[PDB]
Design a binder for these strands. Structure first.
Length: 35
RNA sequence: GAAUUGCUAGUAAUACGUAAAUUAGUAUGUUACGGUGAAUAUUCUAACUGUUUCGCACUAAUCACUCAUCACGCGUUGAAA
């Protein structure tokens, strides 16, 4: 592995994975949705 | 309001369309095709099935089998004025 990409991986070691969606808002919109 | 349909799923739903079969002609039916795309949680009840316990005089097997009744005769034995 290159050092720049090792540094990138080190930086992302600590970061939590961002959420795909807001589960509560997803639930509410799916409750609004029809058809 | 009785009533009823379907129930994790690319399913339901969709004032989403598209195609084909059957036709000379007619689809709101059928079968295909993709687009968008959810919700909910199952205390309960259960025919029926499979193991089982026990009983059994049934064995063509309970619509079973034995027992008893009623009549018809043919016998046998007993008591007898």
């Amino acid at each position: 592995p290159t050092a720049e990409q090792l540094a990138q991986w080190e930086a992302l070691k600590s970061v939590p994975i961002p959420p795909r969606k807001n589960a509560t808002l997803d639930h509410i919109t799916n409750m609004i949705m029809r058809h």
